[PDB]
Scaffold this active site. Structure first.
Site, mmCIF file in Angstrom:
data_model
loop_
_atom_site.group_PDB
_atom_site.id
_atom_site.type_symbol
_atom_site.label_atom_id
_atom_site.label_comp_id
_atom_site.label_asym_id
_atom_site.label_seq_id
_atom_site.Cartn_x
_atom_site.Cartn_y
_atom_site.Cartn_z
ATOM 1 N N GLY A 1 0.812 -1.144 0.095
ATOM 2 C CA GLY A 1 0.006 0.018 -0.013
ATOM 3 C C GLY A 1 0.887 1.248 -0.008
ATOM 4 O O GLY A 1 2.210 1.138 0.013
ATOM 5 N N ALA B 1 1.331 3.567 2.544
ATOM 6 C CA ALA B 1 1.946 3.966 3.400
ATOM 7 C C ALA B 1 3.155 2.931 3.635
ATOM 8 O O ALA B 1 4.328 3.302 4.065
ATOM 9 C CB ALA B 1 1.305 3.704 4.829
ATOM 10 N N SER C 1 -0.055 0.137 6.108
ATOM 11 C CA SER C 1 -0.976 0.916 6.915
ATOM 12 C C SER C 1 -2.085 -0.087 7.660
ATOM 13 O O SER C 1 -2.315 -1.207 6.939
ATOM 14 C CB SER C 1 -1.748 2.015 6.257
ATOM 15 O OG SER C 1 -2.569 1.651 5.459
ATOM 16 N N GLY D 1 -7.488 0.417 2.421
ATOM 17 C CA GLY D 1 -7.979 -0.808 1.882
ATOM 18 C C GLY D 1 -7.064 -1.852 1.645
ATOM 19 O O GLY D 1 -7.042 -3.166 1.710
ATOM 20 N N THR E 1 -7.172 9.413 5.937
ATOM 21 C CA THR E 1 -7.736 9.510 4.636
ATOM 22 C C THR E 1 -9.266 8.923 4.466
ATOM 23 O O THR E 1 -9.860 9.125 3.675
ATOM 24 C CB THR E 1 -6.773 9.044 3.484
ATOM 25 O OG1 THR E 1 -6.682 7.786 3.634
ATOM 26 C CG2 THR E 1 -5.796 9.747 3.492
ATOM 27 N N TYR F 1 3.923 13.627 5.200
ATOM 28 C CA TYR F 1 4.203 12.060 5.075
ATOM 29 C C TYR F 1 5.676 12.252 4.948
ATOM 30 O O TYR F 1 6.279 11.438 5.599
ATOM 31 C CB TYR F 1 3.400 11.368 4.067
ATOM 32 C CG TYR F 1 1.919 10.983 4.145
ATOM 33 C CD1 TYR F 1 1.454 10.569 5.312
ATOM 34 C CD2 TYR F 1 1.227 10.800 3.155
ATOM 35 C CE1 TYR F 1 0.237 10.493 5.661
ATOM 36 C CE2 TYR F 1 -0.088 10.710 3.186
ATOM 37 C CZ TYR F 1 -0.604 10.213 4.452
ATOM 38 O OH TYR F 1 -2.158 9.979 4.625
ATOM 39 N N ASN G 1 7.650 10.001 7.453
ATOM 40 C CA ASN G 1 8.215 8.754 6.938
ATOM 41 C C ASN G 1 9.879 8.737 7.222
ATOM 42 O O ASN G 1 10.276 7.664 7.534
ATOM 43 C CB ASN G 1 8.097 8.650 5.537
ATOM 44 C CG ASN G 1 6.446 8.329 5.339
ATOM 45 O OD1 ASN G 1 5.516 7.907 6.161
ATOM 46 N ND2 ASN G 1 6.131 8.231 4.034
ATOM 47 N N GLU H 1 15.128 -13.902 16.981
ATOM 48 C CA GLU H 1 15.714 -13.194 18.344
ATOM 49 C C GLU H 1 14.626 -12.452 18.679
ATOM 50 O O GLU H 1 14.562 -11.847 20.009
ATOM 51 C CB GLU H 1 17.113 -12.868 18.394
ATOM 52 C CG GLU H 1 17.782 -12.936 19.559
ATOM 53 C CD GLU H 1 19.390 -12.383 19.629
ATOM 54 O OE1 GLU H 1 20.041 -12.830 18.628
ATOM 55 O OE2 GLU H 1 19.731 -11.700 20.421
HETATM 56 N N1 LIG Z 1 3.011 7.567 8.351
HETATM 57 C C1 LIG Z 1 2.444 7.443 7.288
HETATM 58 N N2 LIG Z 1 1.015 7.091 7.153
HETATM 59 C C2 LIG Z 1 0.536 6.941 5.916
HETATM 60 C C3 LIG Z 1 1.363 7.180 4.766
HETATM 61 N N3 LIG Z 1 0.273 6.888 3.706
HETATM 62 C C4 LIG Z 1 -0.719 6.710 4.240
HETATM 63 N N4 LIG Z 1 -0.807 6.706 5.548
HETATM 64 C C5 LIG Z 1 -1.709 6.505 6.560
HETATM 65 O O1 LIG Z 1 -2.482 5.262 6.033
HETATM 66 C C6 LIG Z 1 -3.967 5.409 6.018
HETATM 67 C C7 LIG Z 1 -4.176 5.327 4.655
HETATM 68 O O2 LIG Z 1 -3.779 3.974 3.976
HETATM 69 P P1 LIG Z 1 -3.036 4.060 2.644
HETATM 70 O O3 LIG Z 1 -1.677 3.508 2.883
HETATM 71 O O4 LIG Z 1 -2.927 5.222 2.095
HETATM 72 O O5 LIG Z 1 -3.895 3.000 1.974
HETATM 73 P P2 LIG Z 1 -3.600 1.990 0.993
HETATM 74 O O6 LIG Z 1 -2.732 0.819 1.225
HETATM 75 O O7 LIG Z 1 -2.877 2.752 -0.210
HETATM 76 O O8 LIG Z 1 -5.005 1.258 0.378
HETATM 77 P P3 LIG Z 1 -6.185 2.036 -0.649
HETATM 78 O O9 LIG Z 1 -5.545 3.028 -1.172
HETATM 79 O O10 LIG Z 1 -7.418 1.950 0.097
HETATM 80 O O11 LIG Z 1 -6.281 0.859 -1.723
HETATM 81 C C8 LIG Z 1 -4.108 6.704 6.793
HETATM 82 O O12 LIG Z 1 -4.322 6.478 8.223
HETATM 83 C C9 LIG Z 1 -2.819 7.388 6.405
HETATM 84 O O13 LIG Z 1 -2.555 8.677 7.356
HETATM 85 C C10 LIG Z 1 2.627 7.476 4.809
HETATM 86 O O14 LIG Z 1 3.256 7.822 3.774
HETATM 87 N N5 LIG Z 1 3.005 7.719 6.133
#
Ligand SMILES: Nc1nc2c(ncn2[C@@H]2O[C@H](COP(=O)(O)OP(=O)(O)OP(=O)(O)O)[C@@H](O)[C@H]2O)c(=O)[nH]1
Ligand SMILES: CCC1=C[C@@H]2CN(C1)Cc1c([nH]c3ccccc13)[C@@](C(=O)OC)(c1cc3c(cc1OC)N(C)[C@@H]1[C@@](O)(C(=O)OC)[C@H](OC(C)=O)[C@]4(CC)C=CCN5CC[C@]31[C@@H]54)C2
Ligand SMILES: Nc1nc2c(ncn2[C@@H]2O[C@H](COP(=O)(O)OP(=O)(O)O)[C@@H](O)[C@H]2O)c(=O)[nH]1
Ligand SMILES: [Ca+2]
Ligand SMILES: [Ca+2]
Ligand SMILES: [Ca+2]
Ligand SMILES: [Cl-]
Ligand SMILES: [Mg+2]
Ligand SMILES: [Mg+2]
Ligand SMILES: [Mg+2]
Lengths: 430, 438, 350, 54
Positions: B10, B12, B140, B144, B179, B224, B228, B254
């Site tokens: 995903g 994140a 994340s 989804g 989001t 982000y 990150n 471990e």
């Molecule tokens: N720390 C951090 N959180 C993130 C980042 N990108 C998204 N999130 C968090 O992750 C959640 C959103 O999920 P995403 O990772 O964007 O979703 P996805 O895996 O691409 O899944 P879908 O877009 O629904 O298909 C939210 O809570 C965001 O704040 C990131 O780059 N860093």
């Protein structure tokens, strides 16, 4: 999920549909010829959501123009951007619909709907990843109303896994005087609650009030009304047309905005409210945008937000501003009026910011509310409907096209059920 | 030497993955084009850094990484970014349309159409491994894909690599940057279906990172990118012992041995110090005692919670920089007389300490200042269950009304999965309370 | 406009705090599960401390200290005093106490008797009392109250019953002192300058020890099985003005010198002991809490702490002043609008 | 406070300090769950396409 196919139907659907394409063409730097001449490259990044790339870097709106009579789209040709549309996407008949939903849905529109679906198919087939459809129409006439909802029904049969979104203009006696418009709207809402995923309720009542009382336009025209509609359509589709995180495609918007399938009728808001001539000389501040976009006087549906509760809210700020301040002010609204946001949907307000402002503004804000107060709008239509229907007045215009009474009492029941379901969640607690 | 494969799932997981792998390259002196001048065994080797990188005859050092997103735009900028020549095209797997923030869409509907492709490209990395230990999975909770595809992969990886360890790095949702409204739904769904397939998961609450960036980096509105790069530092501290010479946490087993006495209670809390702004003009370097004490401040945890009101089951101190044991045990002696540190009875009150002399590598032009010594504490305290209670309360509020539930039923999921998932979480909250409260 | 929620509708003190905040025109009560609150007046059991301090845009405060129950439940207090070095077993102001579990279900029962028969070895006053966290029994033989605890199903405490208490005349009668202490978010310790003496209406009788009304000073048992309830003082409540004058007229001392010094000393000692475990100085939410300390004065004017209550009620003619001080000191210090306390602090050098 | 199992190297040190001694479903069942939900999708869709045919 990338491409959206846009359909505009009937007189209103084509008028506001044309101004939408003018407005967002400018924002993306496309001119009437279909050429890019823009300064930023955010403009082209997601241009394929609404436009098809063609001959030698020409952009063609993925737009289909439907009417049962021609003067509609002879007038769109005559328009500023009329030559930007794909000429084979002008689908039109000869007879008109006579503000008659039944003629749009069952007789005249049936004659023409298959050839509309051919243009839809040719546009849907050429899409890397179709996300779904948006329709512009009024609910008070015959073509956009009855033939629009016939279209929605047939698209859903052919594309059941794609999102259906409408921009639906609600009739108001402050603007039009055709008696049967409540019949047409009630039959139309019946369809919409079953076959759309998200509907923007663009109330002519609220448009009238904004123009007459707030902008002091004492002889409002459809150009005054449509000026507020294209600002709203621009704002609510910002997240689809520019890069960003929140509600960036139709489905993710639907997942964020629709907690229950039938309650998908949104109340749109916009700040600052402005006249067509008007060229305001001061940008609003972030706290000002914030309070205006939530103010009842800035809603595009004639509903009192304080009479209901917000299930979900999307807020879109446009221009160069402090994201910290936007965050702070958005947090202020919720924490200062917490009663109006249902407690059983935590964090139901989501906020997006885009740095490209609308033409003529440095700062603007667009509201999309899913509020239980939208029941007031359906209640208003419902009262005008039953005042005539209890005496069966003007039904012969509809039974003469093959419709039965039962079909009316079913549409009336489904609409009163919807109002009822909104009341249910207005009274729910944790 | 034994290899580890990283799987980034995903947006994140992928963007954090970009942040880590950038940091790994700078820490190992690997260049954007994969060339590593200091590596003198050319085209091969079994140093500790080969845990994470394989080699080519041309001298290219290639991450043992798979990136997976159901939509293409995020991994596309990996295909075109500064580290494009680092990754093999077959490591970067994209679909066409995403999970629309829907667990069920990413688990049942879209996951099925891509699961076997991902497994095959994971196998291709596994085939390059003389002795694979297992997997590090970045995702994340809230998206989804991150929730729903991850839990499907974690089920199949248990099937195909039954004795390999699996560790997660998990982004716990926060409204300041989340989001979607249904992120609590997705979180619990993916926690329930992944619980049995994960040996040890490090949760990062985006709220905690967001307020560290604000308070200690003076960042008005953290991006982000901001988040990150801080997460990457913490991830790097945690994986340093797999990538460098040492004797603590030298393999994935471990981590479980040292941090997870009870298998379901496998969420160590991570605390990091110090976080110093790069544009802070004048700065007084913090001592061993000062950074170790900061390990016991909730404002430095990856998850806000209060470990005074729980119990400890294990504690690991991971130092980077100018640290020697004498200063660690003095700092620890002072700290225990001043703070509430209570271990469960069936465990020794003690710390496992690891020191690496090279201080943290900061990304040039980032927000973090270079420091002489830093520490990451990994503590398995029951206090982290506070984050489960928060998530579960949000869930109960929404599910009681069946809000948004139709979106999941629409994708083939049964309403009963909601309540099976929720009673797994209720059991988990009761496990934590038995262990950590009398 | 500040926001608050109420989740303890049986609380007299915070009923009145709620009423006072509304009357400021600057506080709105939300309904108990609305999360967007500035202030929580919370429940007594399972207050959801884990959910405070995670609302962006809201400073959040709650009227209880997480962990403060270790001061406010009797078995916990004993274990706290006996195990904490700054309170110690070398502690002159807490009666010899022992935590005892029913045989039914660490325990000190056989370490209890070693000192018990130590008292028997010199045949010293060996009377004790056992109580729970009405519901009590004083004896002179371990066996009666020992079994009394097993005859019930939860842990008890046995502590030296103070055989030679201070008795006010006219009446030759027992009493206890209740002190109201407010600890704010900064961990300032505020002693309410008004205390109360919950008195007995019956003469103390050394000879027979299950006369519950002459031994048990509690307000409930007094306006029941006593039939002189209210003769000497109104509501079996003596206040400090009066008791001070009795001290000057009968004993040639003052309330401040003979009693309050020891009381202030005990309050600060207890509260500074637990401070690192419950302080909210660097926490994502903040706490304050009103406490009720209960003391007994023996015949040589020595003060003893008998227990700490975490959800105290106030005396009726005092409710108005105390809860206003709460709003002033504990609430509006965090949420400013548009003393009755003595601050407890002492920094000796060595 | 005892220091245990101390290991040194050029990259750093590690050790342990003690202040106090002690006081999966098949490939088959999985696939059976993805198909079961898939057919629940196709059923829900068939009912819609049936309703629209009416
Ligand atoms: N720390 C951090 N959180 C993130 C980042 N990108 C998204 N999130 C968090 O992750 C959640 C959103 O999920 P995403 O990772 O964007 O979703 P996805 O895996 O691409 O899944 P879908 O877009 O629904 O298909 C939210 O809570 C965001 O704040 C990131 O780059 N860093
Ligand atoms: C957006 C496009 C649009 C707006 C609206 C109607 N049309 C189309 C043009 C138009 C206007 N006028 C006309 C006279 C002759 C031919 C055309 C027009 C108007 C205008 O610019 O007027 C100066 C206007 C009209 C009305 C209106 C307000 C109003 O603009 C203030 N109402 C609320 C009307 C009334 O029904 C009513 O209730 O007012 C109390 C009205 O009756 C009376 C006593 O005025 C009246 C007046 C004709 C009578 C009955 C029914 N229709 C509809 C609403 C109402 C109007 C503007
Ligand atoms: N806001 C707005 N409403 C319009 C416009 N044109 C017509 N309407 C409204 O739409 C309804 C008439 O429907 P219409 O679109 O004209 O009929 P159709 O051609 O058969 O679809 C009435 O309620 C009108 O007030 C327009 O340009 N803007
Ligand atoms: Ca015809
Ligand atoms: Ca090598
Ligand atoms: Ca396993
Ligand atoms: Cl295996
Ligand atoms: Mg018309
Ligand atoms: Mg045909
Ligand atoms: Mg994504």
């Amino acid at each position: 999920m990338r491409e959206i196919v846009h359909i505009q139907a009937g007189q209103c659907g084509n008028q506001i549909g044309a101004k939408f394409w003018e407005v967002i063409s400018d924002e993306h730097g496309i001119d009437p010829t279909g050429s890019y001449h823009g300064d930023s490259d955010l403009q082209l990044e997601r241009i394929n959501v609404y436009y098809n790339e063609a001959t030698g870097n020409k952009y063609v709106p993925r737009a289909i123009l439907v009417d049962l009579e021609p003067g509609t789209m002879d007038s769109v040709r005559s328009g500023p951007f009329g030559q930007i549309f794909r000429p084979d996407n002008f689908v039109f008949g000869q007879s008109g619909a006579g503000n008659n939903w039944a003629k749009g849905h069952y007789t005249e529109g049936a004659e023409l709907v298959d050839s509309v679906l051919d243009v839809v198919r040719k546009e849907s087939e050429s899409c890397d990843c179709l996300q779904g459809f948006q329709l512009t129409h009024s609910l008070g006439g015959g073509t956009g109303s009855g033939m629009g909802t016939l279209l929605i029904s047939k698209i859903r049969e052919e594309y059941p896994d794609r999102i259906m979104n409408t921009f639906s203009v609600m009739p108001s006696p402050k603007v039009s005087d055709t008696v049967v418009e409540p019949y047409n709207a009630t039959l139309s809402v019946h369809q919409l609650v079953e076959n759309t995923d998200e509907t923007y309720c663009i109330d002519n009542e609220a448009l009238y009030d904004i123009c007459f009382r707030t902008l002091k336009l004492t002889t409002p025209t459809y150009g005054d009304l449509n000026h507020l509609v294209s600002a709203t359509m621009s704002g609510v589709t910002t997240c689809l047309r520019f890069p960003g995180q929140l509600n960036a495609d139709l489905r993710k918007l639907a997942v964020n905005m629709v907690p229950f399938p039938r309650l998908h009728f949104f109340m749109p808001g916009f700040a600052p409210l402005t006249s067509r001539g008007s060229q305001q000389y001061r940008a609003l501040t972030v706290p000002e945008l914030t309070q205006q976009m939530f103010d009842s006087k800035n809603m595009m549906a004639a509903c009192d937000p304080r009479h209901g509760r917000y299930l979900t809210v999307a807020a879109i700020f446009r221009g160069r501003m402090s994201m910290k301040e936007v965050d702070e002010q958005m947090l202020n609204v919720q924490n200062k009026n917490s009663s109006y946001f249902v407690e059983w949907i935590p964090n139901n307000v989501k906020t997006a910011v885009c740095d490209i402002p609308p033409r003529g503004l440095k700062m603007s804000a667009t509201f999309i509310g899913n509020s239980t107060a939208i029941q007031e709008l359906f209640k208003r239509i419902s009262e005008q409907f039953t005042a005539m229907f209890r005496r069966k007045a003007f039904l012969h215009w509809y039974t003469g096209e093959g419709m039965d009474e039962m079909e009316f009492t079913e549409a009336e029941s489904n609409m009163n059920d919807l109002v009822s379901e909104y009341q249910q969640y207005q009274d729910a607690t944790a | 030497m034994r290899e580890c494969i990283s799987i980034h799932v995903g947006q994140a997981g992928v963007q954090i993955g970009n942040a880590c792998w950038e940091l790994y390259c700078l820490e190992h002196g690997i260049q954007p084009d994969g060339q590593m001048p200091s590596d003198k065994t050319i085209g091969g080797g079994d140093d500790s850094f080969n845990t994470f990188f394989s080699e080519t005859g041309a001298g290219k050092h290639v991450p043992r990484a798979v990136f997976v997103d159901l939509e293409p735009t995020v991994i596309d900028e990996v295909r075109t970014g500064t580290y494009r020549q680092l990754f093999h095209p077959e490591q970067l797997i994209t679909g066409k349309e995403d999970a629309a923030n829907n667990y069920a869409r990413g688990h049942y509907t879209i996951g099925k159409e891509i699961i076997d492709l991902v497994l095959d490209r994971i196998r291709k990395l596994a085939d390059q491994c003389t002795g694979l230990q297992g997997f590090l999975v970045f995702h994340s909770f809230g998206g989804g894909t991150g929730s729903g595809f991850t839990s499907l992969l974690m089920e199949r990886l248990s099937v195909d690599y039954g004795k390999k360890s699996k560790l997660e790095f998990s982004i716990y949702p926060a409204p300041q940057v989340s989001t979607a409204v249904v992120e609590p739904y997705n979180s619990i769904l993916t926690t329930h279906t992944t619980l049995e397939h994960s040996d040890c998961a490090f949760m990062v609450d985006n709220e905690a990172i967001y307020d560290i960036c604000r308070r200690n980096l003076d960042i008005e509105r953290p991006t982000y990118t901001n988040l990150n790069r801080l997460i990457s530092q913490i991830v790097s501290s945690i994986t340093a012992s797999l990538r460098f010479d040492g004797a603590l946490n030298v393999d994935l087993t471990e981590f479980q041995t040292n941090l997870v006495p009870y298998p379901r209670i496998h969420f160590p809390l991570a605390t990091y110090a110090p976080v110093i702004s790069a544009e802070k003009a004048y700065h007084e370097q913090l001592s061993v005692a000062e950074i170790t004490n900061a390990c016991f401040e909730p404002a430095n945890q990856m998850v806000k919670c209060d470990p005074r009101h729980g119990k400890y089951m294990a504690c690991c101190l991971l130092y980077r920089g100018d640290v020697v044991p004498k200063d660690v045990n003095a700092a620890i002696a002072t700290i225990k007389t001043k703070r509430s540190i209570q271990f469960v009875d069936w465990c020794p009150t003690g710390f496992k300490v690891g020191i690496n002399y090279q201080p943290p590598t900061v990304v040039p032009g980032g927000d973090l200042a270079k420091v002489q010594r830093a520490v990451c504490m990994l503590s398995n305290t029951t206090a982290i269950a506070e984050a489960w209670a928060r998530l579960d309360h949000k869930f109960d509020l929404m599910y009681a009304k069946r809000a948004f539930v139709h979106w999941y039923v629409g994708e083939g999921m049964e309403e009963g999965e909601f309540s099976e998932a929720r009673e797994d979480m209720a059991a988990l909250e009761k496990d934590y309370e038995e262990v950590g409260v009398d | 406009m500040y926001t608050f929620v109420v989740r303890d509708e049986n609380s007299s003190v915070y009923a009145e705090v709620s009423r006072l905040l509304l009357a400021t025109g600057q506080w709105k009560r939300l309904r108990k599960d609305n999360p967007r609150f500035n202030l929580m007046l919370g429940e007594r059991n399972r207050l959801p401390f884990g959910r405070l301090g995670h609302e962006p845009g809201l400073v959040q405060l709650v009227n209880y200290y997480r962990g403060a129950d270790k001061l406010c439940r009797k078995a916990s207090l004993v274990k706290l005093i006996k195990t904490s070095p700054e309170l110690s077993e070398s502690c002159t102001w807490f009666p010899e106490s022992y935590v005892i579990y029913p045989t039914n279900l660490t325990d000190e029962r056989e370490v209890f008797l070693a000192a018990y028969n130590r008292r028997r070895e010199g045949r010293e006053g060996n009377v004790w009392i056992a109580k729970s966290s009405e519901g009590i029994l004083i004896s002179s033989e371990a066996s009666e109250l020992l079994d009394f605890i097993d005859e019930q199903g939860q842990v008890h405490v046995i502590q030296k019953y103070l055989e030679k208490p201070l008795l006010l005349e006219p009446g030759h009668r027992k009493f206890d002192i209740r002190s109201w202490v407010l600890v704010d978010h900064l961990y300032n310790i505020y002693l309410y300058r008004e205390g109360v003496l919950r008195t007995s209406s019956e003469p103390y009788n050394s000879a027979n020890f299950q006369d519950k009304t002459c031994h048990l000073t509690n307000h409930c048992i007094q306006k029941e099985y006593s039939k002189n309830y209210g003769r000497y003082e109104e509501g079996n409540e003596m206040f400090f003005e009066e008791f001070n004058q009795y001290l000057m007229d009968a004993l040639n001392t003052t309330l401040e010198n003979s009693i309050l010094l020891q009381i202030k000393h005990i309050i600060r000692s207890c509260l500074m002991c637990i401070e690192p475990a419950i302080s909210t100085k660097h926490l994502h939410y903040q706490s304050f809490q009103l406490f009720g300390f209960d003391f007994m004065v023996d015949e040589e004017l020595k003060v003893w702490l008998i227990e700490v209550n975490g959800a105290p009620a106030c005396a009726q003619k005092l409710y108005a002043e105390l809860c206003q001080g709460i709003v002033d000191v504990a609430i509006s210090s965090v949420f400013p609008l548009a003393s009755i306390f003595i601050k407890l602090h002492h920094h000796h050098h060595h | 406070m005892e220091v245990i199992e101390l290991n040194k190297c050029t990259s750093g040190q590690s050790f342990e300090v003690i202040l106090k001694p002690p006081s999966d479903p098949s490939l088959e069942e999985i696939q059976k769950k993805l198909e079961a939900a898939e057919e629940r999708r196709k059923y829900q869709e068939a009912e819609l396409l049936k309703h629209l045919a009416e």
